[PDB]
């Protein structure tokens, strides 16, 4: 029963700005015998294993840049990132080793950046999938900011809402953009009744949709 908790849950900071985040302990982490605060901070970039950044509250793991600064004592700790980089996109965790080990809930750091329009691309069903009796139309909406984006699917000039799967990537560690995948799944017989297939993306970057289309009799 040492409860670890972090603040905030998430935030977004532009590159070159300062980040500060907090970590609480339900009981002091100061060892009276060794006089260290047994509190570590870890960085888990998207898709990766956690990496140690700081230990004993304020000692930098070697290799770790001087723009990461751990501070605090007792029950209250702070990680500060100065001149934040695009690659600092990660979830940050504090961890006590004063009595066994316990992780806090984590702080998710978004990077704020300038609005970008998506590159939209549409893909007809492959012949190998059709031969099985189904048909997936895929639409990629790549390298856009902010994450908020709408996708409408249109068959023969008409909207279709059933059978859509969407998936957003985690933010990009280098250019801070998002990407998204939209997949429409029909049967082959459903697919072969209609001619026009349209992926329509509305993003805040323009007042007209980005529209990618293909015609099935052109296949």
């Amino acid at each position: 029963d040492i409860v670890m908790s972090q603040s905030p849950s998430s935030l977004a900071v532009s590159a070159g700005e300062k980040v500060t985040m907090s970590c609480k302990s339900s009981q002091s982490l100061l060892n009276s015998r060794t006089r260290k605060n047994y509190l570590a901070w870890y960085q888990q970039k998207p898709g990766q294993s956690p990496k140690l950044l700081i230990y004993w509250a304020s000692t930098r793991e070697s290799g770790v840049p001087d723009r990461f600064t751990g501070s605090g004592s007792g029950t209250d700790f702070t990680l500060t990132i100065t001149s934040v980089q695009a690659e600092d996109l990660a979830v940050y965790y504090c961890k006590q080793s004063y009595n066994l080990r316990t992780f806090g809930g984590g702080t998710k750091l978004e990077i704020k950046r300038a609005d970008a329009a998506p590159t939209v691309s549409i893909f007809p069903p492959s012949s190998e999938q059709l031969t099985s009796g189904g048909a997936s139309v895929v639409c990629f909406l790549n390298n856009f900011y902010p994450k908020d984006i709408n996708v409408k699917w249109k068959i023969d000039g008409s909207e279709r809402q059933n059978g859509v799967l969407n998936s957003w990537t985690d933010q990009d560690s280098k250019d801070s953009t998002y990407s998204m995948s939209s997949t429409l799944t029909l049967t082959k017989d459903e697919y072969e009744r209609h001619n026009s297939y349209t992926c329509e993306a509305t993003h805040k970057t323009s007042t007209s949709p980005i529209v990618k289309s293909f015609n099935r009799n052109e296949c």
């Binding site: 570590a40 140690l52 984590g106 790549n142 990537t169």
Partner: protein, 221 residues
């Protein structure tokens, strides 16, 4: 290289047992405490337990969440760490990492492994269908063409997707799997110079370790 490498993950049924292993090399194993940490998808890190070093007689300590159900052991002949997990339930579906822990003064986790994913489900192993995504009919005038692979209808997670066996690393977006009616589906795009495709061949390599599936799908016009 100090290296740590977990194995033994895969699908298991509610109530079942499963043992995980963690291969170590590149450091003096007996000198180190060794920990298991878990992470449900999209969730927080959770410490499970450790086994102490030789100086501390290889004693174990467990978190209350697993104490009585999980067992940690080590093989000092071969520098291998183990996690026995019994009476598994849905909550235990997670990535399990082994971490190189304490050495007597030093208080940190400097080395973790890549993780092994455990899925606790009544659902059946189902391999993916891999479908190429070649453009239909547009001007490819961009200087940049985007291609794809669709990895559809598999269980359990994970899959791995590379392009040209890792040679194409830049401009790849692999999109997190989405669960719809007990099967996963994901996709991955690659953006190469239109100069380079179709004239240079582009292949997605896909694996689904749960079914020992290995696919090399060439993207053909």
């Amino acid at each position: 290289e100090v290296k740590l490498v977990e194995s033994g993950g895969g699908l298991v049924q509610s109530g079942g047992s499963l043992r995980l292993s963690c291969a170590t090399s590149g450091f003096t194993f007996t000198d180190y405490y060794m920990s298991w940490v878990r992470q449900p998808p999209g969730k927080a890190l959770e410490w499970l337990g450790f086994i102490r070093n030789k100086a501390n007689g290889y004693t174990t300590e467990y978190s209350p969440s697993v104490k009585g159900r999980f067992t940690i052991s080590r093989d000092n002949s071969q520098s291998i760490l183990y996690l026995q997990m019994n009476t598994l339930r849905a909550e235990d579906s997670a990535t399990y990492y082994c971490a190189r822990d304490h050495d007597g003064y030093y208080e940190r986790f400097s080395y973790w492994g890549q993780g092994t994913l455990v899925t606790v489900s009544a659902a059946k192993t189902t391999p993916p269908s891999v479908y190429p995504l070649a453009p239909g009919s547009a001007a490819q005038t961009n200087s940049m063409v985007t291609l794809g692979c669709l990895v559809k209808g598999y269980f359990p997670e994970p899959v791995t997707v590379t392009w040209n066996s890792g040679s194409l690393s830049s401009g790849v977006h692999t999109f997190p799997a989405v669960l719809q009616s007990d099967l996963y589906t994901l996709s991955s795009s690659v953006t190469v110079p239109s100069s380079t495709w179709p004239s240079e061949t582009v292949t997605c390599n896909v694996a689904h370790p749960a079914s020992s599936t290995k696919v090399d799908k060439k993207i053909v016009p």
